[PDB]
Structure 1
Amino acid sequence: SELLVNTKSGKVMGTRVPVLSSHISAFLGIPFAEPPVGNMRFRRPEPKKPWSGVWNASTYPNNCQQYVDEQFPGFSGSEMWNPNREMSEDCLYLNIWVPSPRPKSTTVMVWIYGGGFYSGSSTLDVYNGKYLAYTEEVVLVSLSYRVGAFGFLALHGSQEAPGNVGLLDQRMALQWVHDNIQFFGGDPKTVTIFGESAGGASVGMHILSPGSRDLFRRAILQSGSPNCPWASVSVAEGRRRAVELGRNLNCNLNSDEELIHCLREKKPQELIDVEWNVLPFDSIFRFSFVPVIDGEFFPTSLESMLNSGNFKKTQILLGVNKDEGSFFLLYGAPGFSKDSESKISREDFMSGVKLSVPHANDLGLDAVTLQYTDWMDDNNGIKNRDGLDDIVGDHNVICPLMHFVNKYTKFGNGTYLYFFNHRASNLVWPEWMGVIHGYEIEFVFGLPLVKELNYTAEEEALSRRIMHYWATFAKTGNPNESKWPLFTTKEQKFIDLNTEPMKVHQRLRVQMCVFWNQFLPKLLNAT
């Protein structure tokens, strides 16, 4: 039967799913690790014991335990990101969409969800792999991983909560694909990992980490990169936050053993309830439990790894959205609101810069302010709001990504760069937020193809192009079969991604990124 697959872990029974008036197979909820529960909380994952019988893979699995956004109750703009299944610590499952009839050896794409390493679900509507699997004739995988404390609590030296265990979940899933995708018709020698935001930083982390490099062929990074200032912490900072978390829960802090024991007795929601209390600064775009530079998963600092070429050499396709910061300013900066135009005073602007660059001394805060202020028109509400939006986007997403691409391009075997600037016609978030962080994903997954979702015909066209680029890149290492130019060290070309005829440009946001990647870091080092 087309819906029965015998893998090395046991047999699995899929379900036939309708897609744009045709059908494909879906194998949902395949376990790839032992449930990370009890004494196994904060531990490295453990491979799933093979099972006899037929695993029923016809429904989506639980989503990991995570903080749940209740900012706009009922609003679809925010709720589409919230878990849509029961949460459980028993959450380590993957999902496979397979063309029909079953291929013999095709391109595989593995999606790694974002959510700031504190949230995310493989089971979201915008992540439904059936459009891309069907359209591009790829085998589409989506994995899952522990988030928040469960995924990233770090007490370096201890084996009970080493840190990085959420990254090891992703790795075990990539191990299960390596070992089993062939039985689904996928080519394990032609896997692309792709992910957005923490998913893109994850993808870059598997390129860096020696124990992941061998488990995939190529990588796509959307609005994230491993060297992002929010994507990792020192072992000492990880340690300080695990201790503070236990402090919030009245744990015995005498030893790691005492701490870890106490944390393992607490219900998931107890951890989730005090999780934001451990941040060291009053900040925006900072997440409590994130990957640590442990000397294992990452042998050395990300930067020295990037300088020496200590990383998988392959092809990469990556890019950013126009207005990466608006979401974080909305949710966290004074003066921004969902239902106004959010024109920002100078007083709120300066409040915003302080939140966006928590680690900066006053001189550093002045350097930023001067770099983004139009002194001919410094009380312009719109210019203040947009300039803050760019600060957040630049510092947190664009310029880290630009640094990664430039460093990577020195040693890699082909780099394709995009700048996604189409604002979807049916976007429910206000205008001021622009081309919002995360809103290229629905184009990547082909939602503009389903009539009922209310996109224009030109949005459908753009979706079909993006998908064809991503899948052709996954297949050949080149998005091209008009032509998207290679990004090279000298010319530094990139394309815009929008409903208009392609335009090639060069040096994406160089003025600002020299400031964030060269000048400001020098400034804070000296002062």
Structure 2
Amino acid sequence: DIIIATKNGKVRGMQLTVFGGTVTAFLGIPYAQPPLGRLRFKKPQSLTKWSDIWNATKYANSCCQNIDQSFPGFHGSEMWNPNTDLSEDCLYLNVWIPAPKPKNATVLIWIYGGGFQTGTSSLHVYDGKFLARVERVIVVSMNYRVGALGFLALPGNPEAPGNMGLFDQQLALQWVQKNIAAFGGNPKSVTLFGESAGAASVSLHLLSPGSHSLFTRAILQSGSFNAPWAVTSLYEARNRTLNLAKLTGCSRENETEIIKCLRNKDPQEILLNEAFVVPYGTPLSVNFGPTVDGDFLTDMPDILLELGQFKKTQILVGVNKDEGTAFLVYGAPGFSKDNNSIITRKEFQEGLKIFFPGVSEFGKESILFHYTDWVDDQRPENYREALGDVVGDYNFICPALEFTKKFSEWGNNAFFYYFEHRSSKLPWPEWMGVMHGYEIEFVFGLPLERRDQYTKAEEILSRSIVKRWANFAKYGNPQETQNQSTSWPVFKSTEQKYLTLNTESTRIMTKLRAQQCRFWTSFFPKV
């Protein structure tokens, strides 16, 4: 039995055997008052002390959210769906610490993705016990509100100010600052890491002054705030809030009575209307996400980035080779996870209309022009891969590169990676390649489990990534120094060196997606 006294009371954990050693897991520690009743849509309130022993013995409830039901029974989609009960009572976090209790361990704080609409800390690919066992770090992960319950926004209105999910995260980071030393963690050695919307959340904490003092360093996998899906303007956020009130029959003149009415609706009626606050949506629709609230975000974030107004520290940023393929089977015509999805020129044009609905004909033609100059017009998969790269380059790769250029320009060390290994256990078909979200299991060291049917070369790769992530956390330098590994150079805006991650050859390259990103970053914003 192992019990830790926290500032709010005692918590009991559990012992796990990992690789012939022991990890202590505290699953489901509350870090806030449950945001129920009159607390729905408001910022999280600070937890009141308890005097019992909280049994942190099971993952807690996941936050309310819609579920991907497009491929029932298919592990490739269902592995991302919540694996605990849905509840508005969901503000809880998990702690994995090595056994024996370390003395001053670097802490790694995971923020999950899911488009700000979905996600939960309890997923199998976010299990921090391997990192705790192997690198002797402490891993913290938290649930935070998503969807309209997490990001409904009426400007300057404390009944629904926006960004509550980001404030959920920030109160967890605070909890770590006040409590993790009881668990043997170093509150001065805290690294945030996240993927997708989680990565965008990490980039926004670097911009939020209230988060400056709650962490040391940041890791951003496949995501950043300047991605086109990541931040909503105060305009549309208020328009979407009011469209939701119409749909639920909550339209009122006094905007506070609107929220009060919305607080008496059942979570399911809110959830089943989120998708319609927008006239035309896409597979990448983020109907309720971060806004410039004037609180978490004190100005438009593109301006803060550009003028150097952010936490000065090291970053580790990266993307996957086929970021965009996952979304093609969620609407684009001619695509299937069950066939090779060879599409025609006409199908590719219709695909752009799905993914760029509110764009001019000239804007959509400009995409087609830049992506259909073929090395061989007789290759039958030209259009299939073009649309994948279009969605990937626009939504993930080019924003990530541009974040890294702009952040490094202010003097901080930056490190960029290009993950190009396709999991040998990946359930999706091969044309989808190195998919969005499928470096996570390597970062968390699941292929270090010999029982789980990865290849030996996948064990070696995960091992080396895990050491690089941990050295970055502890020391700000993502090297693997013992096993002749390729040195990871810093990313400067001049030379733009990045490192490729794969089972074969780890390589230094320059200027990833150079031509593609000059289009997305310096032409397409004008259309």
Shift of 1:252: 2.8
Matches of residues 79-478 of structure 1 in structure 2 within 5 Å? 79-374=78-373, 380-478=379-477
Q: What TM-score do you get using the length of structure 2 for normalisation? A: 0.97
- SS at the partner of 1:278? coil
Pairing partner for 2:494 from 486, 490, 494: 490
Contact 1:108–1:140 (Cα < 8 Å) also in 2? yes
Give the Cα–Cα distance (whole angstroms) in 2 for the partners of residues 258 and 279 of structure 1. Answer: 23
Give the Cα–Cα distance (whole angstroms) in 2 for the partners of residues 376 and 488 of structure 1. Answer: 31
The amino acid that maps onto 1:108 is V
Output one character per residue of 1:109-142: Cα deviation in whole Å (capped at 9) or x when no partner.
0000000000001001111100111111100101
Query: Which of 228-237 and 371-380 deviates more?
Result: 371-380
Shift of 1:285: 1.4
Contact 2:197–2:230 (Cα < 8 Å) also in 1? yes
Output one character per residue of 1:135-157: Cα deviation in whole Å (capped at 9) or x when no partner.
11100101110000110111112
Match of 1:7 in 2: 6
Output one character per residue of 1:229-265: Cα deviation in whole Å (capped at 9) or x when no partner.
1011111100111111122222233232232122211
Match of 1:50 in 2: 49
Pairing partner for 2:520 from 508, 516, 526: 516
- How many residues matched? 522
The amino acid that maps onto 2:323 is E
Contact 2:156–2:294 (Cα < 8 Å) also in 1? no
Give the Cα–Cα distance (whole angstroms) in 2 for the partners of residues 425 and 499 of structure 1. Answer: 11
Give the Cα–Cα distance (whole angstroms) in 2 for the partners of residues 56 and 229 of structure 1. Answer: 41
- SS at the partner of 2:316? strand
Contact 1:24–1:100 (Cα < 8 Å) also in 2? yes
- SS at the partner of 1:212? helix
Shift of 1:375: 5.6
Shift of 1:412: 4.4
Give the Cα–Cα distance (whole angstroms) in 1 for the partners of residues 332 and 155 of structure 2. Answer: 33
Change (3 A) 1:61 1:282: closer
1:31 aligns with 2:65: no
Contact 1:210–1:297 (Cα < 8 Å) also in 2? yes
Change (3 A) 1:110 1:375: closer
Contact 1:445–1:467 (Cα < 8 Å) also in 2? yes
Give the Cα–Cα distance (whole angstroms) in 1 for the partners of residues 182 and 59 of structure 2. Answer: 20
Change (3 A) 1:483 1:375: closer
Change (3 A) 1:254 1:467: same
Query: Which of 222-231 and 286-295 deviates more?
Result: 286-295
Match of 1:499 in 2: 503
Shift of 1:378: 5.3
Change (3 A) 1:414 1:110: same
- SS at the partner of 1:511? helix
Give the Cα–Cα distance (whole angstroms) in 1 for the partners of residues 90 and 203 of structure 2. Answer: 23
Give the Cα–Cα distance (whole angstroms) in 1 for the partners of residues 293 and 170 of structure 2. Answer: 16
Contact 2:374–2:382 (Cα < 8 Å) also in 1? no
Contact 1:349–1:384 (Cα < 8 Å) also in 2? yes
The amino acid that maps onto 1:54 is I
- SS at the partner of 1:107? strand
Give the Cα–Cα distance (whole angstroms) in 2 for the partners of residues 248 and 334 of structure 1. Answer: 29
Shift of 1:452: 2.8
Contact 1:209–1:311 (Cα < 8 Å) also in 2? yes
Unaligned runs of 5+ in 2: none
Shift of 1:357: 2.6
The amino acid that maps onto 1:443 is F
Contact 1:315–1:412 (Cα < 8 Å) also in 2? no
Give the Cα–Cα distance (whole angstroms) in 1 for the partners of residues 451 and 101 of structure 2. Answer: 28
Output one character per residue of 1:31-72: Cα deviation in whole Å (capped at 9) or x when no partner.
001001111010000111111121111111000001111111
Shift of 1:358: 3.1
Give the Cα–Cα distance (whole angstroms) in 2 for the partners of residues 209 and 499 of structure 1. Answer: 37
The amino acid that maps onto 1:230 is W
Query: Which of 264-273 and 43-52 deviates more?
Result: 264-273
Change (3 A) 1:379 1:283: farther
Percent sequence identity over matched residues? 53
The amino acid that maps onto 1:500 is E
Query: Which of 304-313 and 481-490 deviates more?
Result: 481-490
The amino acid that maps onto 1:228 is A
Q: Give the root-mean-square deviation of aligned CA atoms.
A: 1.3
- SS at the partner of 2:415? strand
